[PDB]
């Protein structure tokens, strides 16, 4: 054979956990949709089709600094009439079954999502039932093992950066309400534990902090909070008052005259949430 | 007409004066800053379990409670930042309702933590309507008694029908 | 320190606004000490709390100092503790 | 690599743990204790384990994060008569040394440590991890 | 092609002086703004910017607003961005502009002594009577008409300090605003966003906190509290030699703007007005 | 110019600190500023020396 | 480089103070008028310009 005995080899790896989405019915060709952004070795293990489709989340950058450093950033898809449910922009474990469609999507997915989520018993479930479904000796097992083992792959990859981070001490997040004189803050931290490690980090690549103590520096993103966390989970609401009016643009004469080429101002919602610290660059 | 909004004004001032010590609550240092919190009124939430709380009205009736005010001696023409000043607080009374309806719910967490019973429905808006009440005297105490018999104010009255129409629609959607 | 004066110019007026301030900052530390006062402190502080503590410490020294400025009994325990010099009596 | 005979060097795996028990006053050349001690440590962190309660036979102490002092040869530390010193899992050059003898307690044994002329260690039975 | 570039209505009256005037070419759009990029930039510390609100099919309501050009460690007067009339002239060093420059001050914030002081002083120029009065008519002249033609009482329910949460009592920033020129009043309407949009009792919020701060001092780009918001910013040299020929690049940014996101705008029946 | 000349320091420090919190003051005006300076002093240098020589001179 | 490390070159200079004027604003270009005369070496350090301008 050419390659060399073993020899793990070097390529690209698409990264959003929802990629090995896969009709566990053989006789059934399904093909997920993914963006390229999938292919780009970054901290979003989420393609932006992914985030849009099942979080309401747009990513996005935020630049900072002497040395241009680019922050990841998402942002809201949630509009501003959107209520109740429509406003969790990440389910809680206690609530994605809820809001998540088990029923309306696919096996596969509803496995990855029980993954994501800590939950052993639904895993098992699925995995039992597969075991006493279709033929699942052919060609069903090997797929469904397939898709367990990447997704376990990804997460054994997240769990364990996450947990260092966790109890690191050079670099500090606190996701609440820094304006602790609010009650729709709450113990953002807390909540945040009771993520999965993996969830945790998705939250720290899509919450930017409200302020960043870099070293002796302090740059405040905002004064005021975008979104905040509960039970529910990520919720799309602002902690004071009125919802922030989304307009959506896009995706889901004379004023023209005078407003010819002319700097424009996004209407775009990101996140902005809670306290960081950090200790030199680790950039 | 608007002697009767002077008579309402007054009676007001006084009967906050009588009911504060009526069921003694003055919670009177607070303001209209932010939603409340029952910790600052977890005994007065004890007194008023003592009452049935069914006895109150789901909405506000931001209009006439406000709208005493608004007879003042502007004609003074000294001081156009308290006419600015009355325009500020009835926006931000407006805020404070609109919150308290959106948050309701939440509000209603917070006093089945404190003192959960089941008149806790009439609670929450008891507390909000009070710690308003209170606020409204300290504004009359900054204010000076100078109601004239009538006074027209086209701006203030627009603002106050505009703010007090989303005051209104919100507490409408408090369904149950 | 100029609403402060309002009340007359008192000769150490810079130090008055300190004292002040940290009256203030006193007052609902003491709050928090009683809100803790029941529960049990460890041999050695919270790390992540400590990290949290130190740089935060950092801006507000470097604040205070940029902002350079100008019966005793009881006047030195509690200059001592403004101080925060612990050994306090 | 050269040390001075001024240091003395105890090995334990106890002293994962500061040894306060152990740290004694030293004396000068009039054999007069030394009331002050200087605790040298590799970390600001580490600071926060020495319990100066813990050293009643001083009556001052103080703590520090040992640095290489580039500006001193190794080879013949400055002498600090005025404090007796000890330094707890060094991980650089000792510059400075106390009254007396100047004592140091690691878990680990570098080479700066390595020839060291008095070296005391601590036999443990083995317990091994996984 | 009315250049209504305030401040390139500015001639170095003396000979030996050049005036560049080298301002933005915006000023020929006849747009709200009665002053072109470039100036409100040097003179305000502001940048244009335009803010869409109902952009779906031909509803194109594009509200302007201009941006901080103030760090997160000025403060006093370096933030200052529209300085009240009585602490305008010590904001803005005068002195060390064009004397035409400071008559267009003057006349924006009606210091008509200041005007006449700065007449009396041209008087005195060695060309005075010649070309220096023809200079000053002119300048004054087109300084009158814009100031005249911002003003609306000449021949609606935007409040700017009716937005703040925490404040003790007084707003006021709005009596301030009124004490303004038209021409101040107009910039104000202009570059500042209300933070709140009510039309025909339906409420936008485009911020969970205004941005800007009006107080007797003037406009600041100042924070409601807490810290500033962070806002950041051939000749061939050996330097400039490159070495051998040989990280979110696929994501779009953010802008790190503070846009003047300050007051309510309150809007009767009328409908989604677009004449 | 004027308050070197005249001995104003208190002018010439009073220009100096508007100067510096006036326009982009770092990015060439500082320069050209110091500049200024630094020739008008160096001017004076050359002239007070040899005056005070000529004043006390006999 | 060309010239010697340092060695300070000789050339003429302008001795009249104002000469030194130039308009802090960067952006408005402005030239001081000067008479040649501030270019010989001799006890005035004003051209004959400055002069009659400020001094009469
Ligand atoms: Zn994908
Ligand atoms: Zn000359």
């Not at chain 1, 699925?126 to 469904?144: A, H, M, P, W």
């Not at chain 2, 606020?135 to 203030?156: G, S, T, W, Y």
Request: aromatic share 12%; hydrophobic share 40%; proline share 5%.
């Amino acid at each position: 054979l050419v390659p060399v005995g073993m020899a793990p080899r070097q390529m690209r790896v698409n990264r959003c956990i929802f990629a090995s989405i896969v009709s566990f019915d053989a006789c059934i060709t399904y093909k997920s949709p993914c963006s390229p952004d999938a292919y780009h070795d970054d901290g979003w293990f989420i393609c932006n089709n992914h985030l849009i489709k099942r979080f309401k989340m747009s990513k996005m950058v935020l630049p900072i600094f002497d040395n241009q450093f680019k922050m990841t950033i998402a942002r809201h898809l949630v509009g501003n009439k959107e209520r109740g449910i429509k406003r969790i922009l990440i389910p809680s474990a206690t609530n994605y079954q809820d809001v998540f469609n088990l029923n309306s999507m696919m096996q596969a997915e509803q496995l990855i999502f029980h993954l994501i989520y800590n939950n052993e018993n639904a895993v098992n479930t699925i995995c039992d039932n597969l075991k006493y479904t279709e033929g699942f000796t052919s060609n069903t097992q090997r797929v469904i093992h397939s898709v367990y083992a990447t997704t376990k792959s990804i997460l054994d990859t997240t769990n364990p950066n996450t947990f260092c981070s966790r109890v690191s001490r050079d670099e500090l997040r606190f996701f609440d309400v820094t304006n602790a004189r609010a009650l729709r803050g709450g113990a953002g931290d807390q909540l945040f534990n009771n993520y999965s490690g993996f969830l945790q980090n998705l939250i720290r690549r899509a919450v930017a902090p409200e302020y960043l103590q870099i070293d002796t520096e302090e740059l405040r993103f905002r004064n005021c909070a975008t979104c905040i966390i509960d039970e529910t989970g990520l919720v799309a609401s602002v902690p004071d008052g009125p919802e922030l009016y989304n307009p959506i643009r896009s995706s889901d004469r004379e004023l023209d005259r005078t407003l010819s080429g002319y700097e424009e101002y996004p209407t775009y919602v990101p996140l902005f949430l809670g306290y960081q610290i950090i200790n030199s660059e680790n950039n | 007409s608007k002697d009767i909004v002077n008579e309402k004004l007054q009676k007001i001032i006084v009967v906050t004066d009588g009911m504060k010590r009526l069921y003694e609550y003055c919670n009177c240092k607070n303001s209209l800053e932010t939603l409340p919190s029952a910790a600052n009124y977890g005994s007065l939430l004890k007194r008023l379990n003592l009452y049935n709380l069914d006895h109150i009205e789901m909405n506000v009736n931001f209009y006439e409670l406000l709208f005493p005010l608004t007879l003042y001696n502007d004609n003074d023409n000294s001081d156009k930042t308290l006419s600015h000043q009355l325009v500020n607080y009835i926006f931000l009374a407006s805020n404070y309702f609109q919150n308290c309806a959106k948050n309701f719910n939440y509000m209603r967490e917070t006093f089945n933590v404190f003192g959960p019973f089941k008149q806790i429905d009439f609670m929450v808006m008891f507390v909000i309507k009070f710690n308003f009440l209170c606020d409204m005297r300290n504004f009359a105490k900054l204010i000076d008694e100078l109601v004239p018999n009538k006074q027209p104010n086209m701006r203030i009255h627009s603002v106050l029908v505009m703010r007090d129409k989303i005051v209104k629609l919100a507490f409408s959607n408090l369904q149950f | 320190r100029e609403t402060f004066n309002v009340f007359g110019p008192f000769k150490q007026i810079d130090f008055m606004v300190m004292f002040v301030i940290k009256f203030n900052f006193l007052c609902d530390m003491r709050n928090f000490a009683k809100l803790i006062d029941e529960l049990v402190p460890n041999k050695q502080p919270n790390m992540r709390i400590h990290s949290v503590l130190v740089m935060r410490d950092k801006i507000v020294k470097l604040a205070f100092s940029n902002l350079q400025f100008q019966n005793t009994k009881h006047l030195q325990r509690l200059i001592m503790l403004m101080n925060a010099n612990y050994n306090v009596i | 690599m050269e040390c001075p005979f001024q240091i003395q060097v105890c090995i334990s795996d106890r002293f994962f743990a500061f040894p306060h028990n152990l740290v004694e006053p030293q004396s000068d050349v009039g054999n007069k204790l030394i009331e002050n001690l200087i605790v040298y440590v590799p970390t600001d962190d580490d600071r926060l384990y020495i319990d100066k309660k813990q050293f009643p036979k001083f009556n001052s102490v103080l703590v520090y994060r040992h640095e290489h002092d580039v500006n001193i040869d190794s080879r013949s530390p400055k002498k600090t008569a005025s404090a007796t010193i000890v330094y707890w899992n060094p991980l650089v050059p000792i510059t400075e040394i106390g009254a007396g003898e100047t004592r140091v307690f690691s878990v680990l044994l570098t080479n700066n440590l390595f020839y060291c002329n008095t070296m005391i260690v601590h036999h443990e039975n083995p317990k091994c991890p996984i």
